[PDB]
Amino acid sequence: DQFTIRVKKYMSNPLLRRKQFALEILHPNKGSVAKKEVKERLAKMYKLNNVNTIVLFGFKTLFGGGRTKGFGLIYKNVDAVKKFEKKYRLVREGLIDKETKAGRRASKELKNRRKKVRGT
Amino acid sequence: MKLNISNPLNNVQKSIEIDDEKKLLPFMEKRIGNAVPGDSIGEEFTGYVFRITGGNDKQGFPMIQGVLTNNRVRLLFKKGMKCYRPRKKGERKRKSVRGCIVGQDLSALNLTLVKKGVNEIPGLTDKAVGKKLGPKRASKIRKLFNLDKSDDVRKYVIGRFIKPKIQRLVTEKRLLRKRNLLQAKEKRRLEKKQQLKEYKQLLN
Amino acid sequence: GKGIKKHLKRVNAPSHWMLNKMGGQYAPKTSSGPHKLLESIPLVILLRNRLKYALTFDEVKMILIQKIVKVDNKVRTDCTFPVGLMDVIHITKSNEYFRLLYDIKGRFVPHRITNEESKYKLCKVKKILLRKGRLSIAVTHDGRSIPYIHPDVKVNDTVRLDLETGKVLEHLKFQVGSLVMVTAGHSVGRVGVISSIDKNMGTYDIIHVKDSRNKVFATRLSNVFVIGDNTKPYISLPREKGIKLDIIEERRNRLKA
RNA sequence: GUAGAAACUGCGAACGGCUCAUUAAAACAGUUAUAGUCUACUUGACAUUUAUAAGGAUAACUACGGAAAAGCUGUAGCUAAUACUUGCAUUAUCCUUUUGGAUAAGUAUUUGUUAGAAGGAAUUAUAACAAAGAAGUAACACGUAAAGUGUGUAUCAAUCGAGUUUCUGACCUAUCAGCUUUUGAUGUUAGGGUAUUGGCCUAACAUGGCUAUGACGGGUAACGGGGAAUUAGAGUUCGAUUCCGGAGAGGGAGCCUGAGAAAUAGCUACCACAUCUAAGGAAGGCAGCAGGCGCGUAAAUUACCCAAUUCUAAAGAAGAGAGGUAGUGACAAGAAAUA
């Protein structure tokens, strides 16, 4: 399962302790490669001792197969990941679990419980 | 009907529900703030005196002080009016209220005792309740303790252990912020002298 | 009611901000402050659209929370803060220093500058007014008030302010040999030596400017920022060097590669 | 210490979203003025006539209640606050001349008499003298370099804006030719009012002002513009609707708070509708998002989410039918099978 990870537009962002770039996934005549493989490859190419400090998103496989464009973000550490990543992206990466999805019924309940109409 | 007699000195009150109009007839035609001898309400009430403070008419509309009628009237309510809870800042509303004069219409009535009677009432003048929480200001604490400016009072807390915090203390943080704002005044004055002075030489 | 509007539609935003039509309905309304909303950019688009450090408004907020970015060497944490016509930005974590300038197409660009360079600020005085006690204050394009300015300073002069102390170092006048940068016109961003000052009584005074290549362009006097004397500009200029090239022959340099 | 239900206090709710009824020199557009004004948040300057820290009084809360009902609230008792209210150094100038003595003390704003960096022009900035004089100059909270921030505050300036304002520009109609002027019409003078100028209003006075270059009327199935269709060129027709400006929240009128509202998911009243009621009384405003009736030739889901855009907040963390995502969708538009 070999491919080419063409990293483009790479820049270092100490402000978020990240590294921005975009990916090209050269995998001609073969199906789109799962994200675990490219995580492993990126760790190999950048000498990373783990795999859970990076986030890949925005993967599009283009027309006619054999190519894919996406965006990646390294992080200095998992603490930086948790500090600078949103809940949905953390759940994507599986770092945490999805919070309860009760949603917009809290907006109903919030004003149903008009203040001092409920003693509690 | 459900007369609510309060006792402020004992900080405790009691409610009596009576249906004879002749009993409360002396209460009738008395404005808010009238003193009245509660002799016909009950035998054990003989010798007590009650000050009329409020009430609710048959439909629950409160009695307001300034209105000098025996019935309900509607009037605008401002921010400082006693019978209104404003919805928003400056929001004035017209409401129906009952006049201060009392008649045969009071679904409730609120009095307080002003001069003691000749009998005891269980739970009225037999026990008492304090402030239920102590003063929080250091001036009030110093009034209570008369300890003046000798020592701290955070070792003089009232607990349920767990202690409240005292406002207007003499904390060294307060003293330090005071002296720092003084030093700010001084340094600003000094630098203003110097930067007003240096202007002059380049003025030539 | 009809109080102050607090939203800015994307298509109503200034053009030099370069906000794409399809990328949302609103634009970041810059907070009131040192510069006009029209002739400034907010920090959101300084750190999201130009430096590409952030990918979103929330990321810009995350940057600003840590007291990393400074505007005129003091910490700014407001996302919608006006940066200004020319001023220094310091990103401490990444050690780098910017000055907001105009490219010859009239768009605000962060010019990389050195740490020693990042202590000088060219402020265009706009009003000179004497207050109580005959103390003279100069109100500059930045919006600062500098008291006890040198009497020689005139209304359209420029001063070199020291960022850390807010003191003038030297002033520059508006002779016909003084080089200037244009601020808001068709010729926004050009740098030239001032051909002349055509003053007309009661209306906008026009000034004519010679480029480096002896091309003359006129502008309203309010759209001019003295940048140096006849020797050299007092600031490093962006890569174009304030020379606007004809569209016909910019294509030649684009094609040659 | 970590937090913290409730509540008081602060800020916002005047933005946004919707609609186009009104409106014909009005609104709007370009172009000016504000030397005729107001301006919260934000930014820069920076201040004057118990003190090792001052006062009562209230919410929340506790007990007793009233009413069929409501975002109703009575009485009694406590308690704080950056709520409300009192209130504690000093500087400058003259000289023998680093140094010694001497002299003086109101920010805006208002009145009178004066001198006078800039603007195009000053009764400008400012300065002096004589009277008044607001409001303030921290009795407030948390912690960064191997002193800081927050909150609050007088004035000036900047900024986000607003209100007025100059010049020019609009469809049809004369089977609308004279209009306006007691009832302000045009102007002068004085004042009141305003944030400011102004017949804006009042008193006196004069008889003015507009008009065939179309006044005054009437019509518009008329919000204006950016723009749209059709264009060889001229033109003609359209623009309720992405953006800007205006106006409105069933129709009128009035008003509180506030920097900002004549606000309407603010209040007060009438008119028209209309809900609950125990019949005493309460509560209402979808031309916000869905959705329903009606109307009609004529127009979608009582969906999901704050992930993006951006706003409000005590400002990462909460909210947002703003907004985005999908649903319905032969309105339009593009590519393109049925070999």
Tab-separated table of C-alpha atoms in Angstrom, chain B:
chain	number	residue	atom	x	y	z
B	1	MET	CA	-59.692	37.263	57.517
B	2	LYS	CA	-56.277	35.629	57.915
B	3	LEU	CA	-54.825	38.378	60.061
B	4	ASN	CA	-51.041	38.149	60.282
B	5	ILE	CA	-49.738	39.614	63.537
B	6	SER	CA	-45.994	40.218	63.494
B	7	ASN	CA	-43.570	40.752	66.364
B	8	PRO	CA	-40.422	42.540	65.173
B	9	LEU	CA	-38.572	42.490	68.488
B	10	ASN	CA	-39.103	38.738	68.731
B	11	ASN	CA	-38.679	38.517	64.933
B	12	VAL	CA	-41.616	36.093	64.820
B	13	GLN	CA	-45.265	36.185	63.841
B	14	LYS	CA	-48.545	34.291	64.014
B	15	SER	CA	-51.673	34.096	61.870
B	16	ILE	CA	-55.256	34.034	63.138
B	17	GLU	CA	-58.144	33.192	60.809
B	18	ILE	CA	-61.491	34.552	62.005
B	19	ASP	CA	-64.888	34.979	60.367
B	20	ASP	CA	-66.844	37.224	62.745
B	21	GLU	CA	-67.147	40.737	61.365
B	22	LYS	CA	-67.962	42.105	64.816
B	23	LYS	CA	-64.568	40.933	66.072
B	24	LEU	CA	-62.624	42.967	63.503
B	25	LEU	CA	-65.118	45.838	63.310
B	26	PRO	CA	-62.773	48.152	65.301
B	27	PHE	CA	-60.108	47.477	62.664
B	28	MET	CA	-62.437	48.881	60.003
B	29	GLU	CA	-61.991	52.409	58.620
B	30	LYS	CA	-58.343	52.464	59.704
B	31	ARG	CA	-55.662	53.625	57.316
B	32	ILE	CA	-52.238	52.027	57.021
B	33	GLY	CA	-50.146	52.964	60.026
B	34	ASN	CA	-53.085	53.238	62.419
B	35	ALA	CA	-52.667	51.783	65.888
B	36	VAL	CA	-55.674	49.825	67.106
B	37	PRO	CA	-56.464	47.779	70.251
B	38	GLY	CA	-56.737	44.120	69.328
B	39	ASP	CA	-59.221	43.415	72.095
B	40	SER	CA	-62.193	41.997	70.184
B	41	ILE	CA	-60.132	39.604	68.050
B	42	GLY	CA	-59.532	37.248	70.968
B	43	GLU	CA	-59.597	36.926	74.725
B	44	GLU	CA	-55.892	36.092	74.928
B	45	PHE	CA	-55.393	39.096	72.635
B	46	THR	CA	-56.768	41.441	75.316
B	47	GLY	CA	-54.178	44.050	76.245
B	48	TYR	CA	-52.283	43.782	72.969
B	49	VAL	CA	-52.135	46.658	70.478
B	50	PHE	CA	-51.648	46.210	66.733
B	51	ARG	CA	-50.421	48.589	64.035
B	52	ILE	CA	-52.036	48.125	60.629
B	53	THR	CA	-49.328	47.678	58.000
B	54	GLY	CA	-50.893	46.055	54.939
B	55	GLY	CA	-53.436	43.746	53.436
B	56	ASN	CA	-55.006	42.083	50.428
B	57	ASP	CA	-58.572	42.615	49.260
B	58	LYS	CA	-60.888	39.796	48.198
B	59	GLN	CA	-59.187	39.367	44.823
B	60	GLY	CA	-55.687	39.698	46.267
B	61	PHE	CA	-54.850	43.206	45.096
B	62	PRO	CA	-52.579	44.793	47.720
B	63	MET	CA	-53.305	47.841	49.842
B	64	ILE	CA	-51.082	50.825	49.086
B	65	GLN	CA	-50.487	53.636	51.539
B	66	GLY	CA	-51.133	56.918	49.740
B	67	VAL	CA	-54.424	55.921	48.112
B	68	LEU	CA	-57.183	57.163	50.405
B	69	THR	CA	-60.151	55.182	49.104
B	70	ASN	CA	-62.035	52.105	50.292
B	71	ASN	CA	-61.897	50.374	46.908
B	72	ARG	CA	-59.628	49.415	44.020
B	73	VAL	CA	-58.060	52.041	41.783
B	74	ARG	CA	-55.706	51.800	38.829
B	75	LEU	CA	-52.627	53.988	38.596
B	76	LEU	CA	-49.193	54.178	37.011
B	77	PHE	CA	-46.286	52.632	38.901
B	78	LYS	CA	-42.794	54.107	38.811
B	79	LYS	CA	-39.450	52.567	39.722
B	80	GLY	CA	-39.499	53.594	43.387
B	81	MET	CA	-43.141	52.707	44.010
B	82	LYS	CA	-43.658	50.065	46.659
B	83	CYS	CA	-46.132	47.701	44.950
B	84	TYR	CA	-44.338	47.175	41.615
B	85	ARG	CA	-41.589	44.893	40.324
B	86	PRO	CA	-40.373	46.499	37.074
B	87	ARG	CA	-39.836	44.279	34.053
B	88	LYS	CA	-37.022	46.464	32.699
B	89	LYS	CA	-35.249	49.693	33.570
B	90	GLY	CA	-37.670	52.600	33.423
B	91	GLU	CA	-40.646	50.362	32.633
B	92	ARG	CA	-43.797	51.854	34.159
B	93	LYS	CA	-47.045	49.905	34.283
B	94	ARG	CA	-50.632	50.625	35.251
B	95	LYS	CA	-51.949	48.230	37.888
B	96	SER	CA	-55.064	47.856	40.012
B	97	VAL	CA	-54.463	48.289	43.739
B	98	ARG	CA	-56.654	48.475	46.821
B	99	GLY	CA	-56.872	51.667	48.844
B	100	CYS	CA	-55.343	52.127	52.271
B	101	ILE	CA	-58.703	52.448	54.045
B	102	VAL	CA	-59.807	49.013	55.261
B	103	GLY	CA	-63.341	47.662	54.989
B	104	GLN	CA	-65.204	44.360	54.712
B	105	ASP	CA	-63.081	43.340	51.722
B	106	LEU	CA	-59.746	42.103	53.076
B	107	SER	CA	-59.002	38.520	52.086
B	108	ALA	CA	-55.890	39.061	54.209
B	109	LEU	CA	-54.539	41.631	56.635
B	110	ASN	CA	-51.076	42.416	58.006
B	111	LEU	CA	-50.522	43.985	61.427
B	112	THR	CA	-47.636	44.138	63.867
B	113	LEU	CA	-47.766	44.361	67.651
B	114	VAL	CA	-46.586	47.664	69.106
B	115	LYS	CA	-47.366	47.411	72.841
B	116	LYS	CA	-47.296	44.141	74.762
B	117	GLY	CA	-50.403	42.415	76.084
B	118	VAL	CA	-51.182	40.738	79.395
B	119	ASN	CA	-50.872	37.162	78.100
B	120	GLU	CA	-48.387	34.874	76.390
B	121	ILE	CA	-48.906	33.419	72.919
B	122	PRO	CA	-47.178	30.151	71.897
B	123	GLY	CA	-44.617	31.050	69.259
B	124	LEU	CA	-45.225	34.821	69.387
B	125	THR	CA	-43.716	36.107	72.654
B	126	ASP	CA	-42.361	32.809	74.046
B	127	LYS	CA	-39.310	32.410	71.775
B	128	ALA	CA	-37.318	34.594	69.401
B	129	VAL	CA	-35.049	34.387	66.363
B	130	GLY	CA	-31.900	36.436	65.826
B	131	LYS	CA	-30.577	38.090	62.671
B	132	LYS	CA	-30.120	34.588	61.126
B	133	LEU	CA	-26.776	35.876	59.799
B	134	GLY	CA	-24.226	38.239	61.276
B	135	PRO	CA	-23.107	41.618	59.977
B	136	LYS	CA	-20.500	41.571	57.218
B	137	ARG	CA	-19.025	45.076	57.449
B	138	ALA	CA	-16.045	45.594	59.731
B	139	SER	CA	-17.645	48.772	61.082
B	140	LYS	CA	-20.712	46.779	62.141
B	141	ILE	CA	-18.490	44.080	63.659
B	142	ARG	CA	-16.601	46.751	65.592
B	143	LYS	CA	-19.924	48.177	66.758
B	144	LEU	CA	-20.947	44.730	68.005
B	145	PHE	CA	-17.651	43.861	69.714
B	146	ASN	CA	-16.476	47.323	70.862
B	147	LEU	CA	-12.952	46.030	70.194
B	148	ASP	CA	-12.041	49.288	68.364
B	149	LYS	CA	-8.737	49.177	66.446
B	150	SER	CA	-6.943	46.723	68.743
B	151	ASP	CA	-6.774	43.444	66.802
B	152	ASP	CA	-8.171	41.583	63.804
B	153	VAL	CA	-11.676	40.112	63.712
B	154	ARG	CA	-11.155	37.182	61.327
B	155	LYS	CA	-10.522	35.278	64.568
B	156	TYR	CA	-13.928	36.654	65.671
B	157	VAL	CA	-16.088	34.951	63.049
B	158	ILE	CA	-19.614	33.586	63.397
B	159	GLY	CA	-19.873	30.102	61.925
B	160	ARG	CA	-22.504	27.437	61.433
B	161	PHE	CA	-15.719	25.795	60.780
B	162	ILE	CA	-17.108	28.032	58.010
B	163	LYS	CA	-16.814	31.801	58.257
B	164	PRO	CA	-17.942	34.838	56.246
B	165	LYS	CA	-15.502	37.388	54.881
B	166	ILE	CA	-15.263	40.932	56.221
B	167	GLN	CA	-15.580	44.019	54.038
B	168	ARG	CA	-13.644	47.250	54.596
B	169	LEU	CA	-10.683	45.519	56.226
B	170	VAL	CA	-7.120	46.788	56.733
B	171	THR	CA	-5.483	44.225	54.458
B	172	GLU	CA	-1.859	44.783	53.528
B	173	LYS	CA	-2.943	44.428	49.906
B	174	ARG	CA	-5.145	47.475	50.483
B	175	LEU	CA	-2.279	49.364	52.118
B	176	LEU	CA	0.080	48.361	49.300
B	177	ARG	CA	-2.334	49.463	46.581
B	178	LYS	CA	-2.769	52.781	48.394
B	179	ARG	CA	0.964	53.399	48.648
B	180	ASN	CA	1.469	52.306	45.032
B	181	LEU	CA	-1.074	54.827	43.797
B	182	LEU	CA	0.731	57.462	45.851
B	183	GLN	CA	4.049	56.504	44.223
B	184	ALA	CA	2.304	56.706	40.857
B	185	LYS	CA	1.266	60.272	41.665
B	186	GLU	CA	4.813	61.143	42.723
B	187	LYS	CA	6.571	59.638	39.709
B	188	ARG	CA	4.061	61.168	37.303
B	189	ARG	CA	4.644	64.571	38.896
B	190	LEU	CA	8.420	64.163	38.621
B	191	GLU	CA	8.371	63.082	34.983
B	192	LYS	CA	5.993	65.925	34.165
B	193	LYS	CA	8.487	68.389	35.640
B	194	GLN	CA	11.294	66.918	33.576
B	195	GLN	CA	9.398	66.766	30.278
B	196	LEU	CA	8.052	70.264	30.778
B	197	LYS	CA	11.590	71.445	31.530
B	198	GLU	CA	13.310	69.827	28.546
B	199	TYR	CA	10.825	71.588	26.255
B	200	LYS	CA	12.415	74.934	27.103
B	201	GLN	CA	15.971	74.305	25.895
B	202	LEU	CA	14.814	73.099	22.492
B	203	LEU	CA	12.429	76.064	22.422
B	204	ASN	CA	15.518	78.092	21.488
